[PDB]
């Protein structure tokens, strides 16, 4: 090629990092410890092993494990050869896993032992896959046995920076999972642009070279929010817990002295409510809870335990990271509650992100902080389209912009506050209300446990909300009282307070997606 024409490749994130201490440790929880030198040696050994299998530049290798050093080595060796890395969402149903495997046309499959029963239900219908490698936590692992037979020397090639590196098949509301892919250039730009925006903070929520990293996210969802690529560039100590057990997670955090991690609101609540956390010192921890809609009460409870809690925002199609909550030095004086309300927002855009707010006609509503609209974005690390799709790709990049699909209002200071989802919007009459505030209102009820609000067509008012509630243990309140519970609230538009047609219903169970989210579209078949 051209030596003066530099190419942004993943291999430059490992051999040309910000810092490199050869004696820094990679730790797999109570199973393995090894320095960075041996980590590089193992990456070269895995590259040699993959070359021995016949994995060419255009091939695809699919991984099905937990979080471990094996997944970190796969995040590097497979893209550096040239082949694509397919992160398989374990939490999907086996039929969806079969669909993704056949769609991506994988060649090798690295599957953990605990996921063997799933593959038994599907291996029969799987084609195009030649070799299965079984990963174990003991000395009889096939990955280790294939590493031991290779050498620690390899010459990684130089190719175009626009070669695809990863794919993970997100699964929104489309009927089938949609495949999103990224290149070497996009991933390098992502890690650079996030390290330049969160490392430069003054005193709050910064990731520097003295931190100790831990992922508490599935790490196959989306590149583990890109953080494993950043942590290895800073050359920091990394700890991988494995199966996400709170009893083990707290022990690892206290013992390995973890200072930076990221999780979801349910995992954080589980960690806080554990009784192995009442005498545990948390005043060194920096959780970025960017899963979905960090609650204010949970943020306040975490802040009472001395924890640097701040939310983030991104999706499978966007790198993922698009916005991160960063507090200016004069905002950290606020109190127990005004800090909770600032930290739980969506956050300000990160560097090299545009993030306008538009209407169904693309009209770019003002950022007054009151009017809501869809978020449309432009960034260096957005997927160009869906894999093998064309009409969903056009819907994704309509109007020369990527459509996120979330309805939010941007404050004048730049703070974003996600209000609801586009498909979950209530276009009653000519206004667009959100189902999240109604869901929050009928949750404050002392007898309701889980609530869901969906739309119901009305000839003279378009479509109107419908309320579904689940009662608590030995709690029986009639629908009329539940209606009157929301009828006391104030400060909303439409007829009176849009309270003449709530139409609440009591349902014993509400359908859920296997991921663990409320399934409104399935709900909209059962009742209408």
Ligand X SMILES: COC(=O)CCCCCC(=O)OP(=O)(O)OC[C@H]1O[C@@H](n2cnc3c(N)ncnc32)[C@H](O)[C@@H]1O
Ligand Y SMILES: [C]OC(=O)[C][C][C][C][C]C(=O)O=P([O])([O])O[C][C]1O[C](N2[C]=NC3=C2N=[C]N=C3[N])[C]([O])[C]1[O]
Residue 428 contacts ligand X per CB under 6 A: no
Residue 494 contacts a copy of itself per CB under 8 A: no
Residue 54 contacts a copy of itself per CB under 8 A: no
Binding segment (CB under 8 A) for a copy of itself, from list 110-118, 120-128, 237-245, 428-436? 120-128
Residue 101 contacts Mg ion per CB under 5 A: no
Residue of 45, 166, 261, 346 interacting with ligand Y (CB under 6 A) = 346
> To the nearest 5 percent, what fractions of the chain are helix, strand and coil?
30, 20, 50
Q: Is residue 427 annotated as involved in ligand binding?
A: yes
| Breaks in the chain after residues (C–N exceeding 2.5 Å) | none
Question: Counting beta carbons within 10 angstroms of the beta carbon of residue 95, is it exposed (0 to 12), middle (13 to 18) or buried (19 or more)?
Answer: exposed
Q: Compute the CA torsion angle 278, 294, 249, 196 (nearest 10 deg).
A: -120
* Dihedral sign, Cα of residue 366, residue 369, residue 374, residue 376: positive
d(CA 500, CA 476) in angstroms, rounded, equals: 23
* Residues 162-191 as x/- pattern, contact with ligand Y by CB under 6 A: --------x---------------------
Q: Is residue 54 annotated as involved in ligand binding?
A: no
Catalytic residue among 25, 73, 161, 317: 317
Q: Is residue 359 annotated as involved in ligand binding?
A: no
Q: Which residues have a Cβ under 8 Å from the Cβ of 474 and sit 6 or more positions away?
A: none
For ligand Y, the closer of residues 239 and 396 by Cβ is 396
Residue 238 contacts ligand X per CB under 6 A: no
Look at residues 347, 344, 343 and name the one whose alpha carbon lies nearest to residue 294: 344
Is 113 an active-site residue? no
Rg from Cα positions in the chain: 24
Residue 222 contacts ligand Y per CB under 6 A: yes
C-alpha atoms less than 13 angstroms from C-alpha of 1 in its C-beta half-sphere: 10
Catalytic residue among 123, 276, 300, 427: 427
d(CA 404, CA 313) in angstroms, rounded, equals: 11
Residues in the chain: 528
The residues annotated as belonging to the active site are 170, 317, 427, 432
| Residues that constitute the known binding site for AMP | 170, 291, 293, 312, 314, 316, 406, 421, 427, 432
Residues that bind a copy of itself (CB under 8 A): 3-6, 8, 12, 16-20, 98-99, 102, 105, 124-128, 174-176, 189, 192-193, 195-197, 199-203, 206-210, 233-234, 326, 329, 349-354, 378-380, 382, 384-385, 388-392, 397, 400-402, 414, 521, 525
| Residues that constitute the known binding site for Mg(2+) | 315-317
Residues that bind ligand X (CB under 6 A): 170, 222, 225, 288, 290, 292-293, 311-316, 320-321, 324, 346, 405-406, 418
């Amino acid at each position: 090629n051209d030596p003066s024409n530099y190419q942004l490749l993943i291999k430059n994130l490992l051999f040309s990092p910000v810092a490199f201490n050869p004696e820094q440790e990679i730790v797999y929880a109570n199973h393995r410890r090894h320095s960075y030198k041996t980590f590089h040696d193992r990456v070269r050994q895995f590259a040699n092993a993959l070359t021995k299998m016949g994995v060419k530049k255009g091939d695809t290798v699919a991984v099905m494990d937990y979080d471990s050093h094996r997944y970190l080595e796969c995040y590097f060796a497979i893209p550096m050869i040239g082949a694509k890395l397919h992160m398989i969402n374990v939490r999907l149903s086996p039929e969806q896993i079969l669909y993704t495997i056949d769609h991506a046309e994988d060649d090798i499959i690295l599957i953990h032992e605990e996921f063997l029963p799933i593959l038994d239900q599907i291996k029969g219908r799987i084609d195009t896959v030649t070799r299965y490698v079984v990963l174990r936590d003991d000395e009889e692992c096939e990955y280790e046995r294939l590493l031991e037979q290779e050498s620690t020397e390899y010459n990684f090639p130089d190719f175009d920076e626009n070669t695809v590196a990863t794919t993970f098949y997100t699964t929104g509301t489309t009927g089938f999972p949609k495949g999103v892919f990224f290149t070497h250039r996009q991933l390098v730009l992502h890690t650079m642009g996030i390290l330049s925006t969160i490392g430069t903070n003054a005193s709050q929520g910064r990731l520097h070279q003295g931190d100790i990293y831990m992922p508490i996210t599935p790490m196959f969802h989306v590149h583990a929010w890109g953080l494993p690529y950043m942590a290895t560039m800073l050359g920091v100590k990394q700890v991988y817990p494995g199966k996400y057990v709170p009893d083990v997670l707290l022990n690892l955090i206290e013992q390995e002295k973890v200072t930076f991690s990221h999780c979801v609101p349910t995992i954080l609540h589980l960690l806080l409510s554990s009784p192995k956390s009442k005498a545990m010192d948390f005043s060194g921890w920096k959780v970025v809870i960017g899963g979905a809609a960090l609650p204010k009460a949970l943020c306040k409870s975490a802040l009472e335990r001395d924890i640097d809690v701040f939310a983030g925002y991104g999706m499978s199609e966007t790198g993922p990271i698009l916005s991160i909550v960063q507090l200016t030095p004069e905002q950290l004086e606020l109190d127990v509650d005004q800090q909770a309300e600032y930290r739980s927002k969506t956050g300000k855009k990160v560097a090299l992100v545009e993030a306008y707010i538009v209407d169904e006609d693309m009209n770019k509503l003002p950022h007054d902080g009151e009017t809501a609209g869809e978020i449309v974005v432009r960034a260096p690390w957005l997927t160009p389209n869906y894999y093998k799709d064309n009409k969903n790709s056009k819907a994704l990049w309509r109007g020369g912009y990527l459509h996120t699909g979330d309805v939010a209002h941007i404050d004048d200071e730049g703070f974003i506050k996600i209000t609801d989802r586009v498909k979950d919007m209530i276009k009653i009459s000519g206004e667009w209300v959100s189902s999240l505030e109604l869901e929050d209102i009928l949750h404050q009820h002392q007898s309701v446990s889980e609530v869901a609000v969906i739309g119901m067509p009305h000839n003279k008012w378009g479509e109107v909300p419908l309320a579904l509630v689940t009662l608590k243990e030995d709690a029986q309140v009639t629908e009329k009282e539940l209606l009157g519970f929301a009828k006391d609230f104030i400060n909303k538009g439409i007829l009176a307070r849009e309270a003449l047609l709530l139409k609440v219903k009591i349902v014993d169970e509400i359908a859920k997606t296997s991921v663990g989210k409320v399934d409104k579209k399935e709900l909209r078949k059962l009742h209408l």
